[PDB]
Structure formats: structure tokens, C-alpha cells
């Protein structure tokens, strides 16, 4: 899937180069299935909880982080065009 871009066949199954929106439907599986992101700079980039640096997508397939990090960064999903 998704041309232009780089590539999207081995670990992205929906996302670009990440590691699946899966670890996202990971974040909002415990804080709700209704599915979640993952580093949103909403706000402003330098000024959020202290994360999105653990990739929870890079940072899970990278730094083996179960679903106890998902929980933890339990962040608001932030829908405006997901899909």
C-alpha cells in the first residue's frame, strides 16, 4: 500500500513507516479499543507529557514495551481524520 511513499509492507499495516497503527489500538486497547495514536504533538511538540520519544510504535517494536507503556501513555486519541 501507499506508493509515494517509502515503504508500507513488513511492519506498517495501515501507518507509514511505523511499526502498525496496531501499538496504537494498543494505547487505547486499555484506555479504550476505540483505538489511539501515538506521538501527537497537539499542543505545541515541546510541550506534552514527557513522551512520544518512546516511539511507542518505534520505541515498542525497538524497546520491547508491552501493553504496561501503551497503559502509561494512556494519551487522548486525537481524531480529526484518522482514517
Given at each position: 500500500m501507499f506508493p509515494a511513499m517509502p515503504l508500507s509492507s513488513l511492519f506498517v499495516n495501515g501507518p507509514?513507516?511505523?511499526?502498525?497503527a496496531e501499538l496504537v489500538d494498543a494505547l487505547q486497547f486499555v484506555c479504550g479499543d476505540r483505538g489511539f495514536y501515538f506521538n501527537?504533538?497537539?499542543?505545541?511538540g515541546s510541550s506534552?507529557?514527557?513522551?512520544?520519544?518512546?516511539?511507542?510504535v518505534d520505541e515498542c517494536c525497538?524497546?520491547?514495551?508491552?501493553?504496561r507503556r501503551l497503559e502509561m501513555y494512556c494519551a487522548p486519541l486525537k481524531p480529526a481524520k484518522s482514517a
Open positions: 507509514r513507516t511505523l511499526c502498525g501527537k504533538p497537539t499542543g505545541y506534552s507529557r514527557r513522551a512520544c520519544q518512546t516511539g511507542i525497538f524497546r520491547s514495551c508491552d501493553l
